Ligand binder design. Structure first.
Ligand code: K
Ligand code: MG
Ligand code: MG
Length: 103
RNA sequence: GUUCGCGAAGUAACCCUUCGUGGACAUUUGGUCAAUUUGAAACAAUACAGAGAUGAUCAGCAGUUCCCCUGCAUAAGGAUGAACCGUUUUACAAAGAGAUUU
């Protein structure tokens, strides 16, 4: 498929334009947000992935699978202290959800 | 420059003409900006494609958007103005049961 960094940049531009267009036209599709963040984790660009999860939380902070995905994504890449800040924030905004406490 | 005053020479003329000189009058413009190509107007042309619903053709009216255009416009029109068609995996458990690590 992709043989060169410039070709990776072309691929990333096309996919980012696709995902951003759909999330512009309909921001409330949380699964679309999740798989865009997953795309950026596949690109190993954790800054972009974190930004997408944060924007998704700004669209809807009450949606528990989005929180769990973000926390698990931080832990999967050994970013434990980021995960600690994130989980503390998660319980701080939603203290009555048992799943976040257990996580 | 005009004018008030005082000295020198016309004109012993104290006013008029000239020269020297003290004072008053009048007091800070304009630029966000330089005169052709390299600080960004658009159509048109050319080639190829081509018409929302669906079996076919067409009237529309909306909605979402970090697209706007025409219009005095909160009217109306722009193909129903366009973009929309794609992509889709975990808040993941319980009971068994068969191969097997220990
Ligand atoms: K029509
Ligand atoms: Mg209309
Ligand atoms: Mg419309």
């Amino acid at each position: 498929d992709i043989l060169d960094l410039e070709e990776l940049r072309e691929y990333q531009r096309r996919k980012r334009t696709e995902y951003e267009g759909y999330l512009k036209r309909n921001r409330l599709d949380m699964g679309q947000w999740i798989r865009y963040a997953q795309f950026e984790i596949e690109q190993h660009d954790m800054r972009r992935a974190r930004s997408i999860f944060e924007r998704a939380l700004l669209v809807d902070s009450s949606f528990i699978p989005l929180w769990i995905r973000y926390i698990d994504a931080e832990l999967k890449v050994k970013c434990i202290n980021h995960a600690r800040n994130l989980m503390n924030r998660a319980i701080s905004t939603l203290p009555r959800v048992d799943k976040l406490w257990y996580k």
